[PDB]
Structure formats: structure tokens, C-alpha cells
Amino acid sequence: GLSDGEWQQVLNVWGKVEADIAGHGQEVLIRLFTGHPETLEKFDKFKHLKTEAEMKASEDLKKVGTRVLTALGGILKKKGHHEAELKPLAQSHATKHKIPIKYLEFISDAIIHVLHSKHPGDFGADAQGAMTKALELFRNDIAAKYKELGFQG
């Protein structure tokens, strides 16, 4: 797992997310869908959308982006002791949404990109490596629950 100082860097940048959770959520999702169009096909509510202007205008997209980052913030704040938070998340993503582990890798890279773009002075080289480890931890633990739930992610 991560050191105390690695967790400190992760939570320090996360604090900058809290002042505008929705605005961050929209930027993350738009980065994900533009970099990896196949990922948008998983979102039945808005898989019909084609352009970034449409994505920015979508209220459904902004609300989903808010749920995603709020749930990730909850997990991160647990500093690895997140088994209770991770449980419902694994369950829904292996049954209802069927989200391959590869797509969770794509969104991790999107979050790291957005954080670097909006808060570089709270997200230098070492804080980036710390957030990279925290998100690997997250994916690894979800993949372990996928197996049990019978989803080869």
C-alpha cells in the first residue's frame, strides 16, 4: 500500500476537487469519451452523443460525473481501508454495467490528466505518482471482487 506522505499528497489534491465536483466530473468524462470512444457505449442514457459541445451541455453526463468523483473521494479518504465503500461499486460494475478493468484503467488516466491540467501547483511529479498508486490499488481491489462475482473483467 501507499505511505502516509503518499496518502497526504493524494488527499491534498483531492481537496481542490471538492470546490467544484461537477465541473471536474464533466472534464474527466469528456477526456475519457474523447480518448476512448468505445467507453461511451456503456452509458445507455447518453451513448447517442457525438461531440464535446453536446457532452458539456448534457445534465445527465454532469450528474454521472458527480456521482463517480464523489464515490472515488469516499474511497480515497479511507487510505486503502475501503472494503465497505468498494463493495457496492464492484457489485454494480460486474452485474448491471459490466465495466472491463481496462476501462477503469482509461478513467484513472483521465482523472490524473484533469488534475494535472487544473491544479498543477498541487500536483507535481511525486503527487502524480502517489495518485497513480492509489488508483492502481482501487482497480486491483475491484478486479479481486469481479472474480468472486463471476465477471471476467
Ligand code: HEM
Ligand atoms: C473511478 C472509477 C469509477 C467510479 C468511482 C465509479 C462510480 C460510479 C457510481 C457511484 C455510479 C452511480 C451508482 C452505481 O451504479 O454504482 C456509477 C454509475 C455508472 N458507471 Fe461507474 N464509476 C467508475 C468508472 C466507470 C467507467 C470507467 C465506466 C464505463 C466506461 C462506468 C460506467 C458506468 C455506467 C454505465 C453507470 C450508470 C450510469 C447512469 O446512471 O446513466 N463507470 N459509477
